[PDB]
Structures are given as structure tokens and as C-alpha cells.
Design goal:
It is a single chain. The chain is mostly beta strands. It has one domain: Single-stranded right-handed beta-helix, Pectin lyase-like (Pectate Lyase C-like, 3 Solenoid), CATH 2.160.20.10. The chain has no helices and 14 strands. The chain has strands spanning about 10, 15, 20-30, 50, 55-60, 70, 75-80, 90, 95-100, 105-115, 120-135, 145-165, 170-185, 195. Strands 1, 2, 3, 4, 5, 6, 7, 8, 9, 10, 11, 12, 13 and 14 form a 14-stranded parallel β-sheet that branches. It is globular and about 45 Å long. The relative contact order is 0.11. The structure holds calcium ion and sodium ion. Calcium ion binds near residues 38, 85, 107 and 108. Belongs to the polysaccharide lyase 3 family. It is found in: Secreted. This is pectate lyase. The PDB classes it as lyase.
Length: about 200
């Protein structure tokens, strides 16, 4: 695929991507050291910190997945492959639009995507296999998120596709394929879920 395909970049601290920047790995795989083991422990660093307005593309995140990507809003994450999700794959930490486009995630013991601030969260052209949950809004929070799942294929989902404890949140899906999943959506009311 890209010119860095077959190279492995070993890091020992979070890669910070600045507002208005695009980090383009060109197919590089990233392996983090001393930042986490990819377990469910809470004491782990993100591989990437995407400030507001920062973008990320064309990276493979190898094990250990540590705490994945931290997004501070208005970010695009294109063609990112998590080969072995760590504590979680991506976390929305501050408000704005975040779009995951292309790529894949496998082997998430619990959540893939964690939403900890009001946001518009899009997952597009994306495959995930062997996961607990694809999207979680932070537990017991009642701020509003709006999730879009568009051309998403999921295989082996232990808990559900998406969970939220917020009655004002919404999920919209279009061309969603799901195999071997306990239950699709855990929201206060199933009327919060829509197709388009
Ligand atoms: Ca894992
Ligand atoms: Na996390």
C-alpha cells in the first residue's frame, strides 16, 4: 500500500498531532514501548493525541494498543488499522466532529470507541472483529452524542454494537452488517436508533 509499508516505528511516548496538522504514516506500523500493555488497566497512554482540528491517516497500530487514539474534536482518522485494540481504540475527549473512515479494528476485550464528550461521531467503511462493544458513550452521562455507522461490518460482538445511558443521544446507521452479536443497541429507548 504506502511507501512505509513493512517498516515498524517503535515509540516511547504519545505522538502529538497539532491542530491543523495531518500525520500520514504512509503504511507504517507503530509499536509502543513503556506506554501500556493493551490490557483493561486504566494506567495507559494513548499512542496518538489528536488536538482539535488534527488528522491522522495510514497507520497500523500494532500490539500493545495501549489507550489508542485520543481525539480532542474535529478530527478525521482515515485508514487506521488496529491490529490488536488495547484498553480502547479511540476516545473522544472534547467536543466536535470525529470521523473514522476506512481501516479496521480487531481483538477489543471491551470497547472500541469511547465517547466522553458531546460529539458527532462517524464510523464509515470500517470492519471490526472480535470486540465487546463498537461504541460506548461514557457511562451514566446524559449529554448528547450523535453516532453514524455507515458501511460498517462487525463480526463477533460480545456485548452490543453501541451503548449509551443518555436519552437525548442518537444512533443512525446505513449498510450495517452484523454477525454473531449478543444484542444490537443498549440505549434508554430503541426509538433513539434510526436507519437512513
Ligand atoms: Ca486486545
Ligand atoms: Na481508555
Amino acid at each position: 500500500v504506502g511507501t512505509n509499508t513493512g517498516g515498524v516505528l517503535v515509540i516511547t511516548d504519545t505522538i502529538i498531532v497539532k491542530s491543523g496538522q495531518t500525520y500520514d504514516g504512509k503504511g507504517i506500523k507503530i509499536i509502543a514501548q513503556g506506554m501500556g500493555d493493551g490490557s483493561q488497566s486504566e494506567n495507559q497512554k494513548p499512542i496518538f493525541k489528536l488536538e482539535k482540528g488534527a488528522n491522522l491517516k495510514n497507520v497500523i497500530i500494532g500490539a500493545p494498543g495501549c489507550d489508542g487514539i485520543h481525539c480532542y474534536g474535529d478530527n478525521v482518522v482515515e485508514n487506521v488499522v488496529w491490529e490488536d485494540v488495547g484498553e480502547d481504540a479511540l476516545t473522544v475527549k472534547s467536543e466536535g466532529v470525529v470521523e473514522v473512515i476506512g481501516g479496521s479494528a480487531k481483538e477489543a476485550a471491551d470497547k472500541v470507541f469511547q465517547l466522553n464528550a458531546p460529539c458527532t461521531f462517524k464510523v464509515k467503511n470500517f470492519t471490526a472483529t472480535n470486540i465487546g462493544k463498537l461504541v460506548r458513550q461514557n457511562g451514566n452521562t446524559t449529554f448528547k452524542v450523535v453516532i453514524y455507522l455507515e458501511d460498517v461490518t462487525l463480526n463477533n460482538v460480545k456485548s452490543c454494537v453501541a451503548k449509551s445511558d443518555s436519552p437525548v443521544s442518537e444512533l443512525w446507521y446505513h449498510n450495517l452488517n452484523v454477525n454473531n452479536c449478543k444484542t444490537l443497541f443498549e440505549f434508554p429507548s430503541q426509538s433513539q436508533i434510526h436507519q437512513y
